[PDB]
Design a protein around this ligand. Structure first.
Ligand SMILES: CCCCCC/C=C/CCCCCCCCCC(=O)O[C@H](COC(=O)CCCCCCCCCCCCCCC)COP(=O)(O)OC[C@@H](O)CO
Ligand SMILES: CCCCCC/C=C/CCCCCCCCCC(=O)O[C@H](COC(=O)CCCCCCCCCCCCCCC)COP(=O)(O)OC[C@@H](O)CO
Ligand SMILES: CCCCCC/C=C/CCCCCCCCCC(=O)O[C@H](COC(=O)CCCCCCCCCCCCCCC)COP(=O)(O)OC[C@@H](O)CO
Ligand SMILES: CCCCCC/C=C\CCCCCCCCCC(=O)O[C@H](COC(=O)CCCCCCCCCCCCCCC)COP(=O)(O)OC[C@@H](O)CO
Ligand SMILES: CCCCCC/C=C\CCCCCCCCCC(=O)O[C@H](COC(=O)CCCCCCCCCCCCCCC)COP(=O)(O)OC[C@@H](O)CO
Ligand SMILES: CCCCCC/C=C\CCCCCCCCCC(=O)O[C@H](COC(=O)CCCCCCCCCCCCCCC)COP(=O)(O)OC[C@@H](O)CO
Ligand SMILES: CCCCCC/C=C\CCCCCCCCCC(=O)O[C@H](COC(=O)CCCCCCCCCCCCCCC)COP(=O)(O)OC[C@@H](O)CO
Ligand SMILES: CCCCCC/C=C\CCCCCCCCCC(=O)O[C@H](COC(=O)CCCCCCCCCCCCCCC)COP(=O)(O)OC[C@@H](O)CO
Ligand SMILES: CCCCCC/C=C\CCCCCCCCCC(=O)O[C@H](COC(=O)CCCCCCCCCCCCCCC)COP(=O)(O)OC[C@@H](O)CO
Lengths: 256, 191, 111, 23, 55, 23, 52, 52
């Protein structure tokens, strides 16, 4: 039992890692605000939010193009091509725009947060800031956490808006369905509180998980050049399993 | 402090399991979230398309769920067990006394006065203490049926109330049913 | 810093455009606002499939919504309460006279 | 008046209601 | 505390195999049984649309 | 008994013949 | 192999739960296995397994 | 992606048949009727070779 002991030692250190990351989160969100902390938050909205705007916009257009092309082939055989705008908008708003925009946020803006905090730990800027008398959990970590909780629900709304515009462009303007029936069938079956707000509630839960993992792995890193790179691929794996895992739980409550 | 942090990491996992089973209960996939649901049952002759965890409605408003369907091969009639609801398929003392003084005078009416011995509503005192414990709003000759939710939707059980002076206690068997309408054999006759 | 605050302000403009498109082009939100609507109620024997916030029509024109559906287990008929409208269903100055004279004429005719 | 009760109704017509009409 | 590392390593392999036996059960792959079923037969003239493993 | 043959059947009825009947 | 196996199970659970709610209102719950298998085989299994 | 699609169908059969209660024989027979091997299964492998 040489590897069986190695396997059991592995999952104990991972259980203990969730305990450190839970106490690290309660120390950030339960503390008083300080001086100059809003301006550090607006700077990190540029690095997390605005830098992710180009991958999110082009990926939302490409997904709406496939939905309008595949959804026309199903509906035209049952005489319901007027329900194309209903199925395109309801597939994005409740399934695809919360989930696919959280898998591209964990790859771009999540893995770049655990490389920036991890190279501050290697070059000893976090130990130099602490010996001056400034907590690096408040100065460095806390603006980066709040900038990810705000930027991902702002980016799935832009994801869903171009997905519907991209699906209208292939459906109405190329395959030739009626434009007035596209929007009227959408305004009839899509509700705001049950379909649009329930997609924002999903992406706030995902933004908390994708950013708390990305911030923890850079802080509790191994300050060694291939200990940082091992941590960057842990935030892409752990965030993708948590996004797909919490997605089943949230649809069974909201739409079950 | 490896043990203090390990105990927090176990408490997060157990909290993530307890949130999972709370979400399955709210969703309806496991458990029964209604209101002090008692149990009735009934015996049909065709329950095709009826699944467990289906719907029971009175006049279109949902009053229960289905629990299980078994066959009983000696009589070859299916036996649907369904649990209803205490909050809205029964009544309380303000309505219960409203049918306490009703059922005493209506059952012992001008006809049934000269039909028994001179008790002078002495037997009307015995019947009302059997009334209050465990009574439903389902009268004695309401009939339950298998309806079909639109034109193509799933199947549910509909309780159609009508008439009735006596009422059913909590746990009895509804004695007038009709099963699902075989839309094959409807067209087989119509040719 | 003056660029990074300028670029974040554009990220809030594009978010506000998309929330405007989702609310008022894709959903029914702007089309739920009733003008001094009163409230009536009716009592049915089968309301199966009727949801809250459903539609009320007179000749094909929507004139209200549906508020609440309950049992009333003393009579066991379902009770729907619905709220209508001011303009499309209540009269005005000229119209009230147009029905006041005829309601006397339908009354005090030869019959 | 405003606030009264409309007193003539008829409920929904599902598939078992449509059949019993035609027979 | 090698015995704690030896135990959690056993539960992971036990749960990992029991997931695999439960996966092949929920699919025609092996099993697919019925409670001591005997067998009958019948003769039709048109079975258009009937396929094996019907009900 | 177990293994016998049910000697009372009726087959299916396709929708082509349905129309055929309903002329 | 471990991220792919668990992520494929979680996605098939959502497809069978969402696809039942659509098909049960048009009387076609027997087409559940057709729409689950055809959504994975031509759209979701090539794309989501390439993003992980 | 072949292992991804295989557990996605097993996961969708587990919630559909074993929890929501659709017929097991109609799950697999509707799948064996509309899903082709050359047009639906091989076309998903041709996608994942381009992506790889
Ligand atoms: C037949 C009924 C039809 C439905 C009628 C509803 C009509 C539509 C109107 C409004 C939509 C209501 C739908 C339910 C809403 C889901 C609520 C929810 O899912 O709650 C979420 C819990 O999420 C987590 O923990 C993941 C944990 C999930 C388990 C939580 C269990 C929820 C139980 C309470 C919810 C009551 C549901 C009411 C709907 C009937 C919290 O979301 P946030 O506010 O962003 O919190 C931010 C997080 O970071 C927490 O700090
Ligand atoms: C106080 C706030 C509580 C809010 C959370 C409530 C739910 C709790 C459940 C799960 C929360 C997981 C989030 C963990 C956050 C920290 C992540 C982390 O980092 O922890 C990792 C654990 O893996 C992991 O998350 C496991 C990663 C994969 C998760 C897959 C399971 C997801 C399925 C979810 C099912 C829904 C259940 C909840 C619904 C209510 C381990 O870290 P490591 O780097 O390996 O240790 C370092 C050493 O090993 C050095 O080599
Ligand atoms: C009405 C008709 C109904 C359909 C009838 C078909 C019946 C089903 C049977 C068989 C399925 C045939 C469907 C077409 C197959 C697509 C072929 C294709 O898409 O070709 C791919 C090109 O991909 C790339 O470049 C991305 C480039 C894409 C542009 C390529 C343009 C293709 C034009 C030739 C294909 C003929 C299509 C025949 C179908 C009618 C190549 O794929 P691989 O072999 O993996 O090469 C590996 C790569 O790394 C190249 O080194
Ligand atoms: C239901 C109750 C509310 C929901 C939240 C629930 C979560 C639990 C409670 C959270 C709030 C508790 C209040 C305490 C917050 C603690 C975090 C904090 O206080 O962080 C502060 C940052 O400012 C900051 O609020 C970051 C500045 C503001 C961030 C958010 C900005 C809001 C703008 C978007 C809001 C969306 C609304 C739009 C609706 C359409 C302080 O950080 P620093 O100044 O850099 O420290 C540095 C020094 O110490 C040493 O160098
Ligand atoms: C034909 C009659 C059916 C209408 C056709 C249609 O419009 O297609 C729609 C399909 O997408 C829907 O909505 C259900 C919306 C989500 C569809 C399934 C989600 C797609 C992705 C599945 C999960 C993948 C995980 C995320 C991807 C990585 C269903 O909408 P309706 O059925 O109209 O009902 C509206 C609601 O009340 C629920 O039904
Ligand atoms: C009953 C309710 C279930 C959900 C409630 C649980 C909520 C709390 C979650 C707690 C997570 C456990 C924490 C300890 C285990 C650590 C997780 C872990 O160890 O993480 C991953 C595995 O997670 C994984 O199995 C995914 C781990 C979760 C396993 C889930 C899969 C089986 C669940 C069965 C599905 C239920 C329905 C089907 C039943 C037949 C490991 O991936 P790695 O090979 O290392 O990738 C390499 C990179 O990371 C390094 O560069
Ligand atoms: C109703 C429907 C609602 C929908 C609403 C509308 C949706 C949004 C619309 C449009 C969004 C466009 C996205 C804009 C992206 C802004 C990115 C940005 O603005 O980031 C800039 C860099 O971007 C960079 O890399 C340059 C980034 C790469 C440049 C792109 C190059 C590819 C394009 C060229 C090829 C043409 C495409 C092929 C077509 C045939 C910032 O520069 P940095 O030096 O990094 O930081 C500087 C700071 O230190 C201080 O300033
Ligand atoms: C008909 C349908 C068809 C379907 C077919 C079946 C589908 C496949 C079935 C099962 C596949 C299981 C996946 C097995 C994963 C094997 C990974 C592996 O085997 O990798 C090992 C490590 O895995 C590691 O990290 C250990 C990895 C993390 C351990 C996991 C811990 C999470 C689980 C614990 C928590 C329980 C889950 C919660 C449930 C409530 C290798 O060890 P290394 O030291 O890195 O390399 C050593 C080399 O140098 C020389 O040997
Ligand atoms: C109503 C009765 C019609 C059948 C219902 C059904 O079962 O839905 C099935 C949907 O799966 C299909 O292919 C459509 C399969 C793909 C569905 C849409 C894919 C989801 C994602 C869209 C693209 C984004 C990529 C994912 C992002 C990571 C189609 O089944 P049929 O129509 O029988 O045949 C399908 C083909 O012959 C073409 O029509």
């Amino acid at each position: 039992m040489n590897t069986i002991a190695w396997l059991g030692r592995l999952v104990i250190e991972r259980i203990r890692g969730i305990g450190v990351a839970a106490l690290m989160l309660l120390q950030i969100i339960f503390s008083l605000p300080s001086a100059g902390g809003f301006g550090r938050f607006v700077y990190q909205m540029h690095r997390v939010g605005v830098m992710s705007l180009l991958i999110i916009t082009v990926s939302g257009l490409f997904i709406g193009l496939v939905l309008g092309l595949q959804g026309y082939s199903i509906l035209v055989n049952v005489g319901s091509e007027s329900m194309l705008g209903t199925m395109v908008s309801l597939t994005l708003l409740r399934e695809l725009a919360p989930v696919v925009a959280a898998l591209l946020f964990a790859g771009r803006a999540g893995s770049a947060l655990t490389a920036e905090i991890g190279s501050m730990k290697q070059s000893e800027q976090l130990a130099s800031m602490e010996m001056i008398g400034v907590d690096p959990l408040k100065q460095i970590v806390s603006p980066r956490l709040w900038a990810g909780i705000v930027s991902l629900p702002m980016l799935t709304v832009i994801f869903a808006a171009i997905g519907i515009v991209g699906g209208k462009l292939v459906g109405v303007d190329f395959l030739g369905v009626d434009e007035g029936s596209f929007w009227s069938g959408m305004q009839n079956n899509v509700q705001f509180g049950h379909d649009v707000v329930n997609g924002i509630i999903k992406s706030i839960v995902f933004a908390l998980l994708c950013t708390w993992i990305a911030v923890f792995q850079g802080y509790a890193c191994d300050p060694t050049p291939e200990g940082i790179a091992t941590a960057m691929t842990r935030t892409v794996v752990y965030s993708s399993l948590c996004v797909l895992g919490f997605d089943f739980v949230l649809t069974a409550v909201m739409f079950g | 402090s490896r043990t203090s942090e390990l105990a927090v990491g176990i408490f997060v996992i157990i909290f993530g399991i307890a949130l999972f089973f709370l979400a399955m209960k709210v969703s309806g996939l496991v458990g029964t979230n209604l209101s002090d649901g008692y149990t009735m049952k009934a015996q049909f002759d065709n329950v095709n398309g009826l699944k467990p965890r289906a719907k029971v409605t009175m006049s279109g408003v949902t009053i229960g769920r289905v629990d299980s369907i078994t066959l009983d091969p000696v009589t070859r009639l299916a036996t649907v067990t369904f649990d209803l609801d205490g909050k809205l398929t029964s009544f309380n003392a303000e309505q219960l006394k409203e049918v306490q003084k009703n059922a005493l005078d209506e059952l012992r009416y001008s006809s049934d006065y000269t039909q028994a011995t001179p008790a002078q509503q002495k037997t009307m005192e015995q019947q009302l203490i059997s009334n209050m414990n465990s009574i439903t709003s389902i009268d004695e000759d309401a009939y339950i049926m298998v309806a079909t939710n639109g034109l193509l939707g799933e199947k549910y059980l509909k309780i159609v109330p009508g008439g009735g002076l006596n009422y059913l206690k909590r746990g009895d068997t509804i004695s007038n049913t009709q099963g699902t309408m075989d839309l094959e054999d409807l067209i087989s006759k119509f040719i």
